[model samples]
Target: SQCSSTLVKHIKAPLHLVWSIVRRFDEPQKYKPFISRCVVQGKKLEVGSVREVDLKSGLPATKSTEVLEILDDNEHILGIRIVGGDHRLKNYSSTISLHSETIDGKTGTLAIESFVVDVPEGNTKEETCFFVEALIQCNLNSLADVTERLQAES
Candidate 1:
């Protein structure tokens, strides 16, 4: 068999906006004013861009999550696969594909990804969802900062 397999659900955002957000994720301290002091390490996300994101939760000790993102013309987030030592135990494998789209003044992107998470031997979906949700929130915060700065400058 192929180790582990399952699915995780998450919504995607606008491309140009997400791309802008992704770019800001790599910016240094001076450039990222709104972020205050934070940084995301990746190879300027495009196709096959591998990134290792280190984050601090309300809990103790910082955690590091590794993810690989692939882009496509038809969709904003085509596939996002998690790969790292921590994820290896979970054997978490997912393939995120654009499910649908809607445009009413603002554009909203949606995607569905399947994952086979191991979860420290005794973890619940709630925990997994929490982790994913946190990542989403972090991205949104960074994106907001980027957007605000752009708006101010313009």
Candidate 2:
């Protein structure tokens, strides 16, 4: 089963700035809700390192996830990995990709490709809510910088 979602917002900042903000959240210590940490095994931005989070508590605390691979500017996915969920009910993971293009000859277009966790069968609504909410909270926190750029995009 593949679950999909999209975020199309008009952020009030240049692509680089917004990108920096998003990239910043990739670090574990910066985000409060979903605790994140960078793996420094090979180099600054290399595969094999991971950013993990414990989505079970719903507080956005630190968790664990491994980086399967990394793509440079030319590639679609910047990285891919398997994330751990709080209860271990479902296999939580994501493969994030970014595509950039010029919009209106001035603004920029940012397309996000995310592979997220899908709730399994026999799961209660409350459990699903918690899981989803925790994920949402982490994402919102990650994009807090862009959200603050109210005039950029809505």
Candidate 3:
């Protein structure tokens, strides 16, 4: 009763640098474009942790509840699920995996992000996928710029 899609974005930055930012389940506002802020308790970011994310207007919901499904560093994968939000897209879940891919002798991150979303009651699959993938692309785009900018600084 849902649709799923995958999108890839490669960042011209070291794997460790990009991974450090992606692994921040506690602070996605560092890169996510529409996120106003996130609520993360001090400590570690384990699989059982939860986040209350507040977002800026005009895109989707104003507030969202999310939880970590997986945070595997050895495999460089982060999985998350949106348990609750004010929007209609239900059962929205996503996974992002990162690895080192070289471009012209320089090591960069080959990032892949995929999501499974329950299509809203009154929307077509094309519209749904377009919107979701666009958002993911924006976030990954931001991630790349942020990480690459860090490398540029140093």
Candidate 4:
């Protein structure tokens, strides 16, 4: 079965500030709570850039290799796929988009993330979405928090 999850967060930070954090393909651990570390393989971040990510959980920690598929800085959009990972999920891909918004005359950001995955053998589509959504939600919340803090400091 195939499953997907989408999450949107309203951030009290400028869109550019939020995009600056989200566009760092080599530094996902900066905003994602579950990612402990990330090592970029290429000299620069681009459509084909790759990174190895170490998760914060598991005995020896779960590792995943992700490839950048799309990066449109002008549009504040990014997409990536998990090419290799120590997990049951297959055909996993995710995209994040940021849009500028105004809240009470203050510049703000609207961040959206959507991911699709193939359900594992022992999991139902609903169960897969539940698990993935939880992680994505946490990551989005962290992203918002980090962006807000940066905005305050600037």
Best candidate, lDDT: 3
Cα lDDT, model 3, residue 69:
92
TM-score to true structure, per model: 0.47, 0.56, 0.95, 0.94
For candidate 3, write residues 45-114 as lDDT tens digits.
9997889999987865898999999999988999999998887778999999998899989889998999
Clashing pairs in 1: 6-114, 6-115, 7-114, 7-115, 8-113, 90-118
Model 2 TM-score, 2 decimals: 0.56
Off by over 4 Å in 1: 1-17, 23-46, 54-69, 85-117
lDDT of each: 0.45, 0.48, 0.91, 0.89
What tens-digit string does per-residue lDDT give for candidate 4 at 2-82? Answer: 889789999999988898889999999889887888998656588999999888875233988999999999999999999
Per-prediction CA RMSD (Å): 6.4, 5.3, 1.3, 1.5
Worst 10 residues of 3 by lDDT: 40-49
Q: Is candidate 1 or candidate 4 better by lDDT?
A: 4
> Can you write out model 1's per-residue Cα lDDT over 34-128, one digit (the tens) per residue?
22234344455565555444433443324333355555544544445555533323455454444445556655444344445555546665665
Q: On residues 1-154, what C-alpha lDDT tens digit does candidate 2 reach at each position?
A: 4344433434334555545444432453443344433543445455555554443344434346555566454454454556553444345455444445666776553535354555667665466546654564456445545444553455
Per-residue lDDT of 149 in model 3: 99
